[PDB]
């Protein structure tokens, strides 16, 4: 086995830059590990299944580069319904020009380009080893949901389905 990139990164983050610049052959294999984490290939060489876990991170842009407020988001996004229906969290990181909020981004990039140090807030940025250890320690936990949170979950799901159900 010589997997493209989904096989050397078994248990971890698999990221995709320029998601709309790919083709149908890439999308049909990305959707298969997105739904079920077990690629299966049946060609003249082998008929076998490779199982890997990959928290697909995707970065995409619309059809005309930026957004369009006169266009619907189903028409602004070229991806089909089965692709983003499987996507639970989609982040519309849209930039809006402003007078007050743009100055903080400008001050922050001039502060990090002036020197490598971060801004003087009353907080220190944690190094990679400590939160890597925290993620490895938190991953062994197995939480169990209660009944009082169950009655809130089913009511919010019923209300969200009725609100979403143009």
């Amino acid at each position: 086995l010589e997997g493209g990139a989904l096989v050397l990164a078994d248990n971890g983050i698999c990221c995709i830059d320029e998601f709309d610049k790919m083709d149908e052959s890439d999308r049909t294999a990305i959707h298969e590990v997105m739904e079920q984490q077990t690629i299966s290939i049946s060609k003249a060489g082998i008929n076998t299944t490779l199982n890997a876990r990959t928290s697909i991170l995707a970065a995409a842009n619309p059809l005309y580069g930026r957004y369009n407020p006169r266009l619907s988001p189903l028409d602004n996004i070229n991806l089909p319904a089965a692709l983003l229906s499987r996507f639970d969290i989609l982040f519309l990181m849209l930039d809006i020009p402003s007078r007050d909020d743009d100055e903080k981004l400008a001050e922050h990039v001039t502060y990090v380009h002036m020197h490598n140090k971060q801004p003087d807030l009353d907080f220190t940025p944690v190094e990679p080893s400590k939160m890597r250890e925290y993620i490895a320690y938190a991953k062994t936990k197995r939480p169990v949901m209660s009944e009082a949170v169950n009655d809130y979950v089913v009511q919010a799901y019923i209300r969200l389905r009725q609100d979403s159900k143009d």
Binding site: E24, T28, H31, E32, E35, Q36, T38, S40, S42, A44, I46, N47, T48, T49, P80, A81, A82, S85, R86, R142, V144, M145, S146, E147, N150, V153, V154, Y157, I158, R161, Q162, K165
Partner: protein, 650 residues
């Protein structure tokens, strides 16, 4: 007391207990694991047609005297087969001397007889074959892919002195052939070189056969293996590529298996009584559909279809030129993000043969022969085969599934090979409605972007569309959080749900013990079920559907009610009115007239059903008659007064 070095087998003691088991065995395995003399009749039958082979069932385990023989032949088969060849000849000549006979001793004195043991337990293929299991008996279940042409091995050999012409025959001994140096006769006493001749020497046939193994259980991460087995004489050209073959022999060491037997053909009483007691209930038809997947939702038509799809049906053939298999190829389409992949995995965890996706013939040049080399459907020439994303699949590979839809064959016509071959299992394909995810403003035949010729030939389609609303998806979210209510589902046993191990035993018993016939009595309801879709692939699908309905509930004869639901199935799988109010109104008027025209008003509901529906054609909805009598109960026209008498108002 004779003891071989490194062997716990004595010759005379095992000889006497093998003779004691052979002269006395009358179905003891049926009693402790009618007839009389189970081994005397078979041995007295085989001696007239010339068959020297003896098929032995390792019956040796359940017998009271030979438990020390079954525990001795699993570690040393080469010594026990060699001494069994002498003891079978000795007990046969003891049978010859007991009776009056003709000259049969003139040929059995030099004839040799062997033993082929095959009734041994299963193993985990080549993965469990550790180095402590070398020279032990082993069994492999799988399919063979390539058969090398038989190669002649020289058991004997001729030697001729080229100057004086006296012949000498030499035989083999652990793989060496001594070549005599000089003549020895009295006419050619001179020392001169001999010559080997072979075109006049008998040769043992040998053949290496590629075998794709697949056990009953496979560990996680294991890939299918290709074992090179080797057959010998009297067994050459009996095993070839294309069949599900159980094989057994001696595991040797590169490692190989020296076959002692091939099998080209293929529960307790309390479990059978439990199967018969659970098969007499009425709700079994839904019970199984609920017990096949309790982690999901209802899916009656879809779960009922995959249940009878794995039940199979009836596969009947002719003598020379005809074959038919009870089979249904299913397709799923509709709204996404539901249990589709779950099913596509669950069934891969149920069948013992299947791939999650055709094969191809190859002219192997090393052995100059047409081998086959595959996976996918080819491997599953039995069981099911799961395909997802049918719409995204190419058009060039759709032509091979166009033949396996109803023909179950592979027709390759390419460079080096023009061969049609066997390839029948059943497909389970999940598709998507193009980019639509189903539209109510477009027809079903255009929404899925699937060709009509290839879809009319499909046996069963499934609209698995959601159509989201209230008082449904709320129960969906509640059932998905009900196992999140507790941290462990130990409370899954107090419901009407059969376990998996009882279900597969009942399914395996029903698939191999029932051959139902489709009688002419269900003719009339089939014709009219066909014309409703017509106002031959649907007819061929519904007869396999009706025989699978007959396959369940332990039935050998098909019944008239069994096709009703079948059609409801295919009518629901593709999917207060004013006319219903008018139906209830004329039904109330007609029931008031036929309830008030006679003098004896004391008459129940079953007599009313058989007196108002027999003078006309087929059954009207009885629940509408129950709603009409409840409407008359509310208007005080009729009085219920119990289930034995229905009387009107005074």
């Amino acid at each position: 007391l004779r003891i071989i070095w490194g062997t716990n087998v004595s010759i005379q003691e095992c000889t006497t207990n093998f003779r004691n088991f052979l002269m006395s065995f009358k179905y003891k395995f049926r009693k402790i694991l009618d007839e009389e003399l189970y081994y005397i009749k078979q041995l007295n039958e085989m001696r007239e047609l010339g068959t020297s082979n003896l098929n032995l069932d390792a019956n040796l385990l359940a017998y009271k005297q030979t438990e020390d023989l079954y525990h001795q032949l699993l570690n040393y088969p080469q010594e026990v087969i060699s001494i069994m060849d002498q003891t079978i000849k000795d007990c046969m000549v003891s049978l010859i001397v007991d009776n009056n006979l003709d000259y049969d001793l003139d040929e059995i004195e030099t004839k040799f007889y062997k033993v082929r043991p095959y009734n041994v337990g299963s193993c985990k293929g080549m993965r469990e074959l550790n180095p402590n299991d070398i020279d032990k008996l082993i069994n492999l279940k799988g399919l063979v892919l390539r058969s090398t042409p038989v190669i002649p091995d020289m058991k004997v050999a001729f030697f001729k002195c080229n100057v004086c012409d006296h012949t000498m025959a030499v035989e083999i001994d652990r793989g060496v052939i001594q070549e005599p140096a000089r003549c020895e006769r009295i006419d050619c006493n001179e020392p001169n070189s001999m010559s080997l001749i072979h075109n006049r020497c008998s040769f043992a046939d040998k053949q290496v056969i590629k075998l794709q193994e697949t056990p009953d259980f496979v560990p996680d991460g294991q890939t299918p293996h290709s074992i090179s087995l080797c057959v010998y004489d009297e067994l050459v050209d009996s095993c070839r590529a294309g069949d599900r073959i159980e094989v057994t022999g001696t595991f040797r060491s590169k490692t190989y298996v020296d076959v002692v037997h091939v099998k080209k053909v293929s529960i307790t009483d309390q479990d059978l009584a439990k199967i018969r007691e659970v098969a007499a209930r009425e709700d079994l038809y839904s019970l199984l559909a609920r017990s096949i997947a309790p982690s999901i939702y209802e899916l009656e038509d879809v779960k009922k279809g995959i249940l009878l799809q794995l039940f199979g049906g009836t596969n009947k053939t002719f003598t020379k030129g005809g074959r038919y298999r009870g089979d249904i190829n299913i397709l799923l389409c509709g709204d996404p993000s539901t249990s589709k992949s779950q099913i596509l995995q669950y069934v891969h965890k149920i069948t013992p043969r299947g791939v999650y996706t055709t094969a191809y013939i190859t002219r192997d040049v090393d052995t100059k022969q047409l081998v086959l080399e595959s996976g996918a459907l080819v491997l599953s020439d039995g069981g099911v085969c799961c395909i997802d994303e049918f719409d995204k699949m190419s058009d060039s590979t759709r032509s091979v599934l166009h033949e396996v839809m109803e023909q179950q064959t592979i027709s390759i016509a390419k460079a080096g090979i023009i061969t049609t071959l066997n390839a029948r299992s059943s497909i389970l394909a999940s598709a998507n409605p193009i980019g639509s995810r189903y539209n109510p403003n477009l027809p079903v035949t255009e929404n899925i972007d699937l060709p009509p010729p290839l879809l009319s030939r499909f046996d069963l389609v499934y609209l698995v569309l959601d159509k989201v609303d209230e008082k449904n998806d709320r129960e969906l979210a509640k059932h998905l959080t009900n196992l999140y209510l507790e941290d462990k589902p130990e409370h899954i046993s107090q419901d009407d749900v059969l376990p998996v191990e009882f279900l597969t035993m009942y399914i395996s018993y029903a698939k191999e013990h029932i051959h139902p016939i489709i009688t002419e009595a269900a003719k009339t309801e089939l014709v009219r079920a066909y014309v409703g879709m017509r106002k031959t692939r649907q007819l061929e699908s519904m007869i396999r559907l009706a025989e699978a309905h007959a396959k369940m509930k332990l039935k050998n004869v098909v019944e008239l009610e069994d096709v009703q639901e079948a059609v409801r199935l295919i009518r629901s799988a593709i999917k207060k009115s004013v006319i219903q109010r008018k139906l209830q109104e004329d039904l109330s008027r007609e029931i008031m007239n036929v309830l008030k025209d006679q003098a004896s008003d004391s008459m129940s509901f079953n007599e009313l059903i058989k007196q108002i529906n027999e003078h006309s054609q087929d059954r009207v909805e009885s629940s509408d008659i129950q709603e009409a009598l409840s409407r008359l109960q509310q208007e005080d026209k009729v009085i219920v007064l119990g289930e034995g008498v229905r009387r009107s108002v005074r």
